[PDB]
Design a binder for these strands. Structure first.
Ligand SMILES: [Mg+2]
Ligand SMILES: [Mg+2]
Ligand SMILES: [Mg+2]
Ligand SMILES: [Mg+2]
Ligand SMILES: [Mg+2]
Ligand SMILES: [Mg+2]
Ligand SMILES: [Mg+2]
Ligand SMILES: [Mg+2]
Ligand SMILES: [Mg+2]
Ligand SMILES: [Mg+2]
Ligand SMILES: [Mg+2]
Ligand SMILES: [Mg+2]
Ligand SMILES: [Mg+2]
Ligand SMILES: [Mg+2]
Ligand SMILES: [Mg+2]
Ligand SMILES: [Mg+2]
Ligand SMILES: [Mg+2]
Ligand SMILES: [Mg+2]
Ligand SMILES: [Mg+2]
Ligand SMILES: [Mg+2]
Ligand SMILES: [Mg+2]
Ligand SMILES: [Mg+2]
Ligand SMILES: [Mg+2]
Ligand SMILES: [Mg+2]
Ligand SMILES: [Mg+2]
Ligand SMILES: [Mg+2]
Ligand SMILES: [Mg+2]
Ligand SMILES: [Mg+2]
Ligand SMILES: [Mg+2]
Ligand SMILES: [Mg+2]
Ligand SMILES: [Mg+2]
Lengths: 168, 176, 159
RNA sequence: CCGGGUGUUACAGCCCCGCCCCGGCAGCAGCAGCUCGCCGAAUCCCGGGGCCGAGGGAGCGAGACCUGUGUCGCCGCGCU
RNA sequence: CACGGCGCGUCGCGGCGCGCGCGAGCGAGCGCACGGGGUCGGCGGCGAUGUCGGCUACCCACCCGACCCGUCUUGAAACACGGACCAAGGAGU
RNA sequence: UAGUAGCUGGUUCCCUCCAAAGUUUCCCUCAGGAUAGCUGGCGCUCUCGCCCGCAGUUUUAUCCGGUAAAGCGAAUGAUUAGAGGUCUUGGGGCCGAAACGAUCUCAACCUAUUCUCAAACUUUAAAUGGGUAAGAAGCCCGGCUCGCUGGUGUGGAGCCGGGCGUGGAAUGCGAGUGCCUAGUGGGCCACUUUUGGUAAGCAGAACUGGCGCUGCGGGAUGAACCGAACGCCGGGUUAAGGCGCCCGAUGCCGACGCUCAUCAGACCCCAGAAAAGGUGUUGGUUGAUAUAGACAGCAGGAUGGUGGCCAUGGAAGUCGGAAUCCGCUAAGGAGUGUGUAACAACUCACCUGCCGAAUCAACUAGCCCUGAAAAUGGAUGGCGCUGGAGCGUCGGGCCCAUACCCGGCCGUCGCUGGCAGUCGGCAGAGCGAGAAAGAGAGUGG
RNA sequence: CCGUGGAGCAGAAGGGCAAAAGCUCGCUUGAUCUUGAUUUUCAGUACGAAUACAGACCGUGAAAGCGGGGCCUCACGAUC
RNA sequence: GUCUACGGCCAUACCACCCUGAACGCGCCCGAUCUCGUCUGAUCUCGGAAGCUAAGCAGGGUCGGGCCUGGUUAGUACUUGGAUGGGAGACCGCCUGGGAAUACCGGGUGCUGUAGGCUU
């Protein structure tokens, strides 16, 4: 048997509101930059990220994004955080200035670095503003319960791509 | 488990991570009936945690793949050994069904359990599924379909599509 | 309400461990504490002189004053919504060097040594402790023996 | 024609099993437009319906030997 | 095939890479557009004592919504208290 | 004298921004104050367009604990039951003048076991959790001062000078600091933990979130439940919940079953029910016997010792006490029941004839039914619904919130953003462009 | 002879204690004079209690040392 | 191989019984004038060297007790977080993570620092 390498990149979408959140879950959501329902972001995986996501399992749906999902998310919803301002990325020079020192100079560099989790994935992801996704067309199964028991919360390995296709 | 839609049968094999104590732990294989591979892996971890001293954090899914039906065109009799939880006590049972696919038979089993004993998928623990010869079948509801010259009519056909001609001057016929 | 005694609710905290009563081993007395060591507090009921208050039991502080028999240490205490770094005097029995700092010190010496080395070699070496990375791809070899089936066992009552 | 019994290819068929180039031939997640999947840097094309159109002196080339014009920047092209 | 000059070519490993000169880092026009937020260099009717426009405001009808305010209170539509209506005066100087 | 009032009542225009507390300590303090806490306003010191710090978070190290659990063949304290020993004593007896000389015993005692326990027990001992560290204020050198400590320029501390930048876990984020200060100091509710109480919409705590201070979609109705928090609008999509009609949405040729109620059932909080039962029906478990011919059902037998022994006035089998044998047999119990005072008589167990293939139990779990009685007429929200519009497991599609996405508009905040360059026949119209800096001025070959 | 404390340590209880903190003797008055710092309730205020020091006079012991009240947790009181 | 003096960790070192100890040493042992202290030269203190491993002490043994360390019990008990899960309740099941303790069955029975000896 050939066990493939554990995925290094995950996509996380907040699927619960602001009302009535435990302080610890609130702090982890703030750290992950999910301050609004149907916000999304990329997270690189390690022990710290695993435990951090486990703490906030009931509030997020996360999975392993596909290359097409990364492409579509960057091109359609991708805005850059330039000068503490949310600027839509309509030209390569905006990327080139904010990430020139890291040899990211266009959309292709940004997408490649995000998808392969490069040496400066932290800088690229932080430059990337959190994605504001629309409500899932076709509806959710059940927001409250876990994905394994027929809900939407928790970890879904590759079904996050199906979710993204309708949420963006 | 949420028995959503029609179930699928998955072969899942897993093992503990290598440790200084033992280089190569034995691989354990199980048949899981599940809507998809994610819940299949979850059920595998649950069952193997009950059986052996194994946990997902101290293990790994070596392989997980759907196993397709060998003969999906031959109607077969399936015997299922099952273990379920009632409102007071747990019971082992054996039920036979009649279908073309093992996954279809197991889905029938789940629906029948829900219908007859109000047992839920998180309560049912499926144990064994075997093709059973018609001579070895012992439930009359399955045995009564074992004859060469099967013959029966459709006595009282209830009119469907009752609303497409919502106002019709006939009184419908139920004998065809 | 409760009582404001200094030793209320310490019958287990200040007690001695099982089969460990009697003479205090002298190694505790024969340790050297200087100015600035990170040190742990653990009240020992065998000696009653210089016993720390129960709220500092299990806390870690920094030594700022060394005296004939006792040591003054600065330790943080959470009082309502604020933390006070207050200094207390504890006799040497109820104190113990913290091993949380020596690991970092040894790491500092070791990565400083490996930074000094390879400086002439020009190669690259990692110093920051990266978190546990995800497991990489590998092959699991079956040795001709197929994995054995696992099935749930039937219910049957024990009691 | 039906019912009961015997039985093992007969005036029907069924299952498994060594090979004959995994026997050979199409074809293949099949518009035999529903027998069962996951997808798209391994994905492109066309079409239909609905809502909106906020902003308003972006310049080009002309060269101190001229003073025009209001279709201009980035990008993708075509012709000489 | 986002390949396209001549050379001196080691700026070189055996040519490709890849450097030094070539009035010395200046070829020009037209045209089309999935290109830093809509335009038409597109049209059709009805207009003098019966017709055009008038969000709101006057009256009426309909569908949906809709418990009386102020106050103390954990909690007010309250089977808690003040209040028939109107004018003027009326309280952190 | 407009006496005082910690107590009632009232306390007059708009928009914009921020936004609480019912908790700590003290008070003849408990309907009130003072003080911390929570708020606002005014600022100030720096910061980025290599690096500093900080965190209701994790990771890697390292300590801290005595709850949940567990234990009593471990300490303390409770606690049941039998085993084996002895004279270590006592108690009923016995042979003995007496004798640990002897017989049983009952006991206390000892040794191994055994049943059940602890908020104020414990050898063990979690999960969740509480500290500390993760570098420049650090490491590595050289040298001075000391009245301290000193076998010893020993130890320690403080001083100077010098060298090391891969800024030494992840993630996120500008930070620090100072004045002045209102209101508040009656709280309540919910999951989980928990004390008193038979219990309570009772009384009292811990953590978190809410209501109060808050509107919106759903739960018919509703301070707290589920979803979601709000500027004025257009389009699209959802959450929770729903889609017979009221009432937007299944007017799907939806899938598989279960259930008949002369009191059916119908969705968290939540608004009504238990023990015990059913040969109603549907599943399941276990054990039997049946072509050496069962289960019914219809018929024949159902005997002797002996009216067995003790018994009672009478007990022949049938009120009572043990046992329960034999030969005859295809079989008959010293008897399963009805009957008389006793019999008698009938009947059963058991075996035969006809009939010729499946039949018996004992449990267990679903729905339904009995258990099930209150007062104005009455409430799955109503109508009503039984090839469901009920119950369980499920599939597509559809409906809509002030939530989410796109667009317009208002305002606030931030960029402590840009513009004095309107530099014009005396001029030459730029400083948006990935790369810290001159469309630089002139002199020689 | 056995005896891990099953005794005692003034008192309630808990902790602690075996060539001792218990019992018996010997000598004494650190229960003395004095300035500061710190902990406990805490507002981080007092009182009370306590902890390390420092400066003198001493006690005890061969000495190292120990001692400025009771083995620790309680036994107490502003202004005028 | 091992002992003595002073120790560190304080049972893997303790407890019960049995066997063996070459040399040095440690001891037992012989006396009370002096030092010193008792009812008692038993203890303590002092002065010695006839005898002995008897005892202490050291090493070893015990299907030894205990102790230490593993397996089993056990992914059981318990438990962070979640659900418009079940149930009239009592309570229980599931999802996401952590994860014990008896009985029972194995293994082991002091390591070591400084100074000084013996094994010529
Ligand atoms: Mg909520
Ligand atoms: Mg739609
Ligand atoms: Mg919830
Ligand atoms: Mg209305
Ligand atoms: Mg009032
Ligand atoms: Mg109020
Ligand atoms: Mg009244
Ligand atoms: Mg009143
Ligand atoms: Mg009135
Ligand atoms: Mg007026
Ligand atoms: Mg007045
Ligand atoms: Mg009052
Ligand atoms: Mg009042
Ligand atoms: Mg406690
Ligand atoms: Mg307990
Ligand atoms: Mg209450
Ligand atoms: Mg609020
Ligand atoms: Mg609200
Ligand atoms: Mg209701
Ligand atoms: Mg809308
Ligand atoms: Mg409705
Ligand atoms: Mg917008
Ligand atoms: Mg003494
Ligand atoms: Mg002194
Ligand atoms: Mg004393
Ligand atoms: Mg003598
Ligand atoms: Mg000896
Ligand atoms: Mg001997
Ligand atoms: Mg042993
Ligand atoms: Mg030694
Ligand atoms: Mg020799």
């Amino acid at each position: 048997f050939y066990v493939p390498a554990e995925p290094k990149l995950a996509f996380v979408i907040r699927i619960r509101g602001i009302n009535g959140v435990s302080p610890k879950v609130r702090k982890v959501l703030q750290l992950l930059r999910l301050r609004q329902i149907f916000n999304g972001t990329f997270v690189k995986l390690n022990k710290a990220s695993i435990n951090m996501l486990r703490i906030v399992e009931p509030y997020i749906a996360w999975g392993y994004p596909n290359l097409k999902s990364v492409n579509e998310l960057i091109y359609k919803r991708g805005y850059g955080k330039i000068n503490k301002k949310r600027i839509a990325l309509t030209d390569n020079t905006l990327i080139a200035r904010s990430l020139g020192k890291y040899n990211i100079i266009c959309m292709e560099d940004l997408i490649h670095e995000i998808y392969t989790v490069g040496k400066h994935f932290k800088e690229a992801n932080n430059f990337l503003w959190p994605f504001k996704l629309s409500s899932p067309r076709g509806g959710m199964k059940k927001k409250t319960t876990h994905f394994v028991e027929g809900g939407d919360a928790g970890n879904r390995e590759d079904q996050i791509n199906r979710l993204i296709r309708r949420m963006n | 488990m949420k028995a959503s839609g029609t179930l699928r049968e998955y072969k899942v094999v897993g093992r503990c991570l290598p440790t200084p104590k033992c280089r190569t732990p034995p691989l354990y294989r199980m048949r899981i009936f599940a809507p998809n591979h994610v819940v299949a892996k979850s059920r595998f971890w649950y069952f193997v945690s009950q059986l052996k001293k194994m946990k997902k954090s101290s293990g790994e899914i070596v392989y997980c793949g759907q196993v397709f039906e060998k003969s999906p065109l031959r109607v077969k009799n399936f015997g299922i050994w099952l273990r379920y939880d009632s409102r007071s006590g747990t019971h082992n049972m054996y039920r036979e069904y009649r279908d073309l696919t093992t996954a279809g038979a197991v889905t029938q089993c789940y629906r029948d359990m829900g219908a007859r004993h109000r047992a839920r998928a998180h309560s049912i623990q499926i144990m064994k599924v075997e093709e059973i010869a018609a001579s070895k079948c012992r439930r009359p509801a399955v045995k009564q379909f074992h004859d060469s010259k099967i013959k029966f009519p459709l006595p009282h056909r209830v009119l469907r599509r009752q609303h497409k001609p919502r106002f019709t001057t006939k009184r419908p016929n139920t004998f065809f | 309400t409760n009582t404001k005694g200094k030793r209320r609710g310490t019958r287990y905290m200040f007690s001695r461990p099982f089969r460990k009563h009697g003479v205090v081993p002298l190694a505790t007395y024969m340790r050297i504490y200087k100015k600035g060591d990170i040190v742990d507090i653990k009240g020992m009921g065998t000696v009653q002189k210089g016993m720390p208050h129960k709220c500092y039991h299990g806390k870690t502080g920094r030594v700022y004053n060394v005296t004939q028999h006792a040591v003054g240490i600065v330790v943080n205490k959470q009082v309502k919504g604020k933390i006070l770094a207050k200094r207390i005097n504890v006799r040497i029995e109820h104190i113990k060097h913290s091993k949380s700092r020596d690991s970092f010190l040894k790491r500092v010496k070791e990565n400083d040594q490996k930074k000094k080395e390879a400086k002439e070699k020009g190669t690259w070496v990692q110093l920051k402790r990266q978190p546990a990375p995800p497991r990489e791809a590998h092959f699991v070899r079956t040795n001709g023996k197929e994995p054995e089936l696992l099935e749930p066992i039937p219910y049957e009552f024990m009691a």
